[PDB]
């Protein structure tokens, strides 16, 4: 007896957006970043994909503070802000992964050049304190 | 209802238990949803890192039985007063799991 | 159940061997209740020669002794060595069965090999029982599929954890915990463990349940094998070891209590390593523990298991599950400080529940209260939890001094 | 299709004869190594080197009362 070969709870196509939106949200191009951003803030069917987005955010910040890559972090914080103002999805099942990611953006040391981008670092702490409150 | 057990194999995995039994051949407000959300039940503060130092699936496929099934119905709350009658389950060798040759 | 007779359509067939063209159905009923009445009177008189002449076989010489008894003429030719053959004839609408008799040349019966000459009846004496049991003389009665390598490994590893000795068990658990290739034998181990925990209901063996829980704890420590696909089987087995009520054969002396906190630590580990937001393992385990604890009529053993698992999950769980029902301690001390029946088994389980409750709620009281704690015990239920909290604050101060 | 397309996907199947031969070979070698180390540790043991039980343990040779029965007879038939 062999149990049937199961299918992922996303369409084969479903996996791709997860893929286009995440590869656009790492901010190679700014209008793209936005296209993805637009999608995250108002896609009604973005539930049932939200575990994979929360895991991508959380896992990303933790292996992205090993080397203090500020853009990678500023893009992820904008992804968190775009996840929050979506009215359709139910977020407080996933906030236990979301909150230690933002605390880490605000309370962490910067492994990259200390001055110069500290101006952005203040904004990394400005965007993180905004989404925290 | 009293549960005296039932066994249908005596030849697959758990044959040792079946033989010890001697079953021959085939013969036989704090329950509010929020309390359980893991923000209110997890020390997520420990995670904050301080001074640290698709044609085929892109994501893995989860155990449908764990994700969907009511395994809670196999918990034996009272041995004598068992609400239903449990039956012997045959080995089902799931092929979704890798690390199994077949 | 009913009077069974030969069929009435079997008498129309017989009446056409005679030459009777049309026989009405009331005549055929008149024939078959008589011939099936005379069959039952020679069936039961042949049985009187089978019983009085002790045979239990009903040979054809029993019927011939009964036809001789009813004065009816004998049936010739039924003592030869034959059997029951029948030959089907399909035909163009006439379905029947016949004999298909065969022939033999006469000189091949004159020249048959003769059978061997019979022996005469003689007597033989032998002892059947000699002042007791029978002697052993010969006149008495005598009294996808695992390869062989891993089949032998499965057999030796499972029979090493049944309880013949402890050292082979420790080496088997150190094998399960530290081998690289035990996949393809994980479903067999999961089935063995879950069925073995189920077999506790037929035999309330505490020891074999402790052995199966140490088998699960050894399976979790293996770095190579991933228990994600088989955790749906191991979760209710450990849950059965936690929240069942009779874990013992003698309830009063068996320490079911340890298989309780060991399996509670085990399920806290199994929902630390495997709980994902797609799984909802921890929320579904807390919900079962919670509705088993808040609900009344539950025995003190299963309430002990619920409190033990909930308190091994962590600090915020005992903040938001245990601490609202601290007034339940009063309902417990109703049956401890003042019980009409003292010699029952509720008192040991109740003060075990009490000791676990105040041991786990002492650091929770140390986290969310003032540092003084002057009459917190008086403010607490029964004034004992508060003494335990004072002891916990003292222990924390000692730990700080050690640091 | 994403807004509406709902076509299922499957997991990546490993139909390669090389890696299947490697998987079956390494799993057989690992289970027979685990079995022989478990049986040499829970019984009488010999050793090619002086006091050598952790590395290369040998199951000790036991004499049979009738040795042709365990030699000549087939076990899988």
UniProtKB/Swiss-Prot annotation, chain A:
Protein name, entry field: Transcription initiation factor TFIID subunit 6
Organism for this UniProt entry: Homo sapiens
Intrachain disulfide bonds: none
Cellular localization per UniProt: Nucleus
Quaternary context: Component of the TFIID basal transcription factor complex, composed of TATA-box-binding protein TBP, and a number of TBP-associated factors (TAFs), including TAF1, TAF2, TAF3, TAF4, TAF5, TAF6, TAF7, TAF8, TAF9, TAF10, TAF11, TAF12 and TAF13. Interacts directly with TBP, TAF1/TAFII250, TAF9/TAFII31 and TAF12/TAFII20. The TAF6/TAFII70-TAF9/TAFII31 heterodimer forms an octamer complex with the TAF4B/TFII105-TAF12/TFIID20 heterodimer.
Residues of the full protein shown: 207 to 339 of 677
In-chain residues carrying the UniProt-annotated modification Phosphotyrosine: 47
Domain of life: Eukaryota
Modification sites for Phosphoserine: 58
Similarity comment: Belongs to the TAF6 family.
Annotated function: The TFIID basal transcription factor complex plays a major role in the initiation of RNA polymerase II (Pol II)-dependent transcription. TFIID recognizes and binds promoters with or without a TATA box via its subunit TBP, a TATA-box-binding protein, and promotes assembly of the pre-initiation complex (PIC). The TFIID complex consists of TBP and TBP-associated factors (TAFs), including TAF1, TAF2, TAF3, TAF4, TAF5, TAF6, TAF7, TAF8, TAF9, TAF10, TAF11, TAF12 and TAF13. The TFIID complex structure can be divided into 3 modules TFIID-A, TFIID-B, and TFIID-C.
Residue positions where Phosphothreonine is found in the record: 42
Disease: Alazami-Yuan syndrome: An autosomal recessive syndrome reminiscent of Cornelia de Lange syndrome and characterized by delayed psychomotor development with intellectual disability, hypotonia, microcephaly, short stature, poor speech, and dysmorphic features.
Swiss-Prot record, chain B:
Effect of residue 63 to D: Found in a patient with X-linked intellectual disability; uncertain significance
Record note on modification: Phosphorylated by casein kinase II in vitro.
Localization per record: Nucleus
Subunit structure as annotated in this protein's UniProt entry: Component of the TFIID basal transcription factor complex, composed of TATA-box-binding protein TBP, and a number of TBP-associated factors (TAFs), including TAF1, TAF2, TAF3, TAF4, TAF5, TAF6, TAF7, TAF8, TAF9, TAF10, TAF11, TAF12 and TAF13. Interacts with TAF7; the interaction is direct. TAF1, when part of the TFIID complex, interacts with C-terminus of TP53. (Microbial infection) Interacts with SV40 Large T antigen.
Domain notes: The Bromo domain mediates interaction with histones that have acetylated lysine residues at specific positions. The second domain also recognizes and binds histones that are butyrylated and crotonylated.
Purpose of the protein: The TFIID basal transcription factor complex plays a major role in the initiation of RNA polymerase II (Pol II)-dependent transcription. TFIID recognizes and binds promoters with or without a TATA box via its subunit TBP, a TATA-box-binding protein, and promotes assembly of the pre-initiation complex (PIC). The TFIID complex consists of TBP and TBP-associated factors (TAFs), including TAF1, TAF2, TAF3, TAF4, TAF5, TAF6, TAF7, TAF8, TAF9, TAF10, TAF11, TAF12 and TAF13. TAF1 is the largest component and core scaffold of the TFIID complex, involved in nucleating complex assembly.
UniProt similarity note: Belongs to the TAF1 family.
UniProt-recorded name of the protein: Transcription initiation factor TFIID subunit 1
Taxonomic lineage of the native organism: Eukaryota, Metazoa, Chordata, Craniata, Vertebrata
Chain's gene name: TAF1
Segment of the intact protein contained: 354 to 532 of 1893
Swiss-Prot record, chain D:
Record localization: Nucleus; Cytoplasm
Expression induction or repression: Induced with triglyceride accumulation.
Notes on the domains: Ectopic expression of the histone fold domain acts as a dominant-negative mutant resulting in differentiation inhibition.
Disease entry from the Swiss-Prot or TrEMBL record: Neurodevelopmental disorder with severe motor impairment, absent language, cerebral hypomyelination, and brain atrophy: An autosomal recessive disorder with onset soon after birth or in early infancy. Affected individuals do not show developmental progress, are unable to sit or walk, do not acquire speech, have poor visual fixation, and show poor overall growth associated with feeding problems. Additional variable features include seizures, spasticity, and joint contractures. Brain imaging shows hypomyelination, thin corpus callosum, and cerebral and cerebellar atrophy.
Family from the record: Belongs to the TAF8 family.
Other known facts: 'Taube nuss' means 'empty nut' in German.
Subunit: Component of the TFIID basal transcription factor complex, composed of TATA-box-binding protein TBP, and a number of TBP-associated factors (TAFs), including TAF1, TAF2, TAF3, TAF4, TAF5, TAF6, TAF7, TAF8, TAF9, TAF10, TAF11, TAF12 and TAF13. Interacts with TBP, TAF1, TAF6, TAF10, TAF11 and TAF13. Component also of a small TAF complex (SMAT) containing TAF8, TAF10 and SUPT7L. Forms a heterodimer with TAF10. Interaction with TAF10 is mediated mainly via its histone fold domain while interaction with SUPT7L is via its C-terminal region.
Stated name of the protein: Transcription initiation factor TFIID subunit 8
